[PDB]
Symmetry: D2
Subunit: 298 residues, 4 copies
């Protein structure tokens, strides 16, 4: 059933577990993510960037909302990192149950202003909002990360429902040389000041096994590095209630596409290579839920 | 908008042009097909095999019906070679506007029996029915009494089959067959046979296994991933005459799969560092859209919406 | 959320309570019933007769199915008393999650043939079926055989009720012994049709607002309580709903001649139906069962 | 099929006819309106007021939108007289294809600010907006409650609104003015020259005598009911009115039938038996309306 973010994110933080948000751009990804959630009896978030809405169009948005409603477990549909008030309005129009505008690159007053305007429109129609303070970039001394104090003020001036924090993560397959630094003490401090559920983006693990599977097939990838699993577990115990995963899914999906087409030159039936790719995505989603502890939490 | 197609097809034959039916299995194929339809302002049929339904499930069926409705051109959603009564029932349940039961391999009475049962079920819920007589197998120009009663639709039988069953369309067997290997050189199409059947069967006619399997495409596929044999499809001119002769609905599947895969292979082959799905499914979807468009140009449905 | 009748009815009998199946013909009725189920945190069944489907059309079926999915309680959408195989097809086409063809009036064999053919089509698409044997009596042994022959999912038995505002004179008959006997031979959930309470208070209210009603007679509460305990898991409800609705439309229009705003007389009428549904859920014991 | 108001209205004004917008509050009304539009091969607008939003809830909004998409004729779903930005947002949320806010009671600049903000939100979403300037009041003081033409042109230019609702004499209800309601056509004709965008006429029910008396007969009471004369509608359209709203005529027709069936049959309590013919009467009214507006066959 369709629900807002706040719904399940609160029980998540109060219960000491995290709910995974997974990015999707088409049918096979949406199925993999929802079946995984059904089998694991876990709540889940379908994340759709603006890039997704562009590639997906009406086909994607109506289907995600439709499958989300028809699922037996709680499912929210979030627009991730919206870039404008107008983008947010389109997400509200397409039935998203949670939205967010990324103005973390703006000065404080501008971020508060943009965010607050989004909060009023979203709440006006029963939708929840994820605010964003600090910039997603790996590393403190320069204070490019979330200021816990500013975080409480941000949440108070805007009336956002949950907060995305910058403590060391970043999108993509190269989050750092070796194990990326995650500022836990900073996270704990923010958590003491912001009781609202916390959000962790750019959280892919980029597992070595997966990195090698990609190479073994199509190949070509550098010193890829993701967020260490132990850091995910710790960040969640401090208050992270929502964790996004996009890169691991893309990698798993393409690795299977390449090995299937590589091993079967004569093959030209789409489902024969996209189906296995879909399965691999579903498996990734499940270990992800197991990792976050959202299993059996629906 | 969502239509049953009978009206789409009736106007197709009445005006001597064909409407393309295109197989889909996911989002990318559905978008390409429908966009190609919006462009060209052409009516179109979204075809889903039983394999598509299993692969796509509710996600696919729900999406195809929606979108079909939203479209600004006439769109029909057909089952295509339904294997059983229960298969047709699943199609009715998922909102298809036209179903098809394939019992061409069975004797005449069993075909009629099964088909008729489908017509009653479909018509009870405002859905149209396509039925086929004769096996879709290729034939050379050597066989005598073979390319007659043995294989290929027999006109007299056609009229009778269509009358005993309440079918609305009728797929005919005149030399076409599925897959990329339709026959050495230009596969023979029994045009006179099609002509006779049309003279006895007024209902719109349907042509399956009609992919063109263009050489350039074959070579593009080999140039990338590769490995395909002496691909041979139905000649464009045969498609034109057949259409001028009463063929109102033409199914295309192989051409789309090949184009889509050709592009996936080359994009992934050219950019090993790529793992963002849309980077290879996007250009693959675009190649499918272009295939559909040219297909509509060949069918004469451009601007017929 | 939208589910088949079996899913909801199976647990009902296994838990010792009954689920109400309330007939709807339009928006206000569908809302009254769903809002009742939500507040009572109870599973519910929306029943649509062939007349309902005729009157409401695709406007009604689309809506009922949509509201049911979005419901925060388990909801089933039933064709109730289908008169033909084609009628059932339509119900499956419109997204119904449960169907039933009424062939009780036919001979056993005809009933079994007709019903078996419905079970085959519905099951083929994941929809469950209710089968009827008797007149709104039923032999406990005929049921067992009837059920095993036609793989139906739940059975409605003739125990002494009758769909109408006059189910007898003194008190309507409810052969509890006959129920237990069949409940012993049929483990599948049992259904009770024509079990309206046609309350004295409502009859009086209906009359006070103009409008005539004969010696109204319905089923007694205790009989429902006992029938349920014995195995009745689904109780069809309609008459009482129409009465309350009409009772209110009348007095509102009578006490306000200048009133021509539809929501002014249909709204309080919708309210009365919601209240009947709630008390109906209490009686069946489905409150807080979602 | 679902379309915004602007599509059909622009065509209407150029071709010289009007498209009817009919208020609905439940299923029966929505069915009556759409069936009439289908049978008349006419485009139609389904109008929902905030009262409708409250009364029908999500059940009504989702149904109206779905049936609109399904129809074989152009159908727009408009919010009529939204009372706030938040209200307009909800309407965008529920899939409406045209919205409007009514702050015409406020001063010009406040009205412009409020409308422009609504325009930006709707257009960003592919939805069109109807602006309102002036108070809907009957007349026989000058510009105290009427639509100042030159002000309209300025109103439309500053607020990128798609169409304009004018106050040239109409008002809501079944009591529009003693005798024949006065319609300030000249006022309309001037505004029309200053504003090329399609015009809208609210409070335009005819309140026909044979329906009023029909109501009294086997029914309740009603004062000296009076609506806009058919001629005033026929001409207002020739001068640029592309959209005409009807609400009261439908409520009356519907209640009249409800009252007659119940009154003539005290034993009746099957809702479909009294709502059904009520729905048929509203449908006949809608059909006559389309005929009057000149939209038949314009689908």
């Amino acid at each position: 059933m369709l629900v807002t973010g706040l719904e399940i994110l609160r029980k998540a933080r109060a219960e000491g577990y995290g709910v995974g948000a997974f990015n999707t751009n088409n049918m096979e990804f949406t199925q993999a993510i929802l079946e995984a959630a059904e089998e694991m009896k876990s709540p889940v978030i379908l994340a759709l960037s603006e890039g997704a809405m562009k590639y997906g169009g009406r086909a994607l948005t109506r289907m995600v909302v439709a499958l989300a409603q028809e699922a037996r477990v709680p499912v929210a549909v979030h627009l991730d990192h919206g870039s404008s008030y107008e983008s947010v309005l389109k997400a509200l129009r397409e039935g998203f149950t949670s939205v967010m505008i990324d103005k973390s690159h703006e000065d404080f007053e501008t971020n508060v202003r943009e965010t607050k305007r989004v909060v009023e429109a979203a709440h006006a129609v029963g939708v929840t909002v994820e605010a964003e303070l600090g910039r997603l970039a790996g590393i403190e001394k320069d204070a490019l990360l979330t200021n816990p104090e500013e975080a409480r003020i941000f949440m108070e001036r805007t009336g956002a429902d949950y907060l995305a924090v910058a403590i060391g993560t970043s999108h993509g397959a190269y989050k750092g040389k070796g194990r990326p630094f995650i500022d836990h003490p900073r996270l704990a401090r923010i958590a003491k000041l912001v009781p609202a559920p916390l959000v962790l983006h750019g959280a892919s693990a980029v597992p070595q096994e997966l990195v090698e599977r990609f190479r073994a097939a199509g190949g070509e990838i550098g010193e890829a590095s993701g967020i260490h699993p132990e850091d995910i577990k710790k960040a969640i115990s401090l208050g992270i209630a929502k964790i996004n995963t996009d890169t691991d899914l893309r990698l798993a999906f393409t690795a299977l596409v390449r090995e299937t087409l590589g091993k079967n030159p004569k093959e030209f039936d789409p489902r024969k290579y996209l189906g296995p790719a879909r399965e691999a995505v579903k498996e990734v989603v499940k270990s992800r839920m197991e990792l976050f502890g959202s299993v059996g939490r629906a």
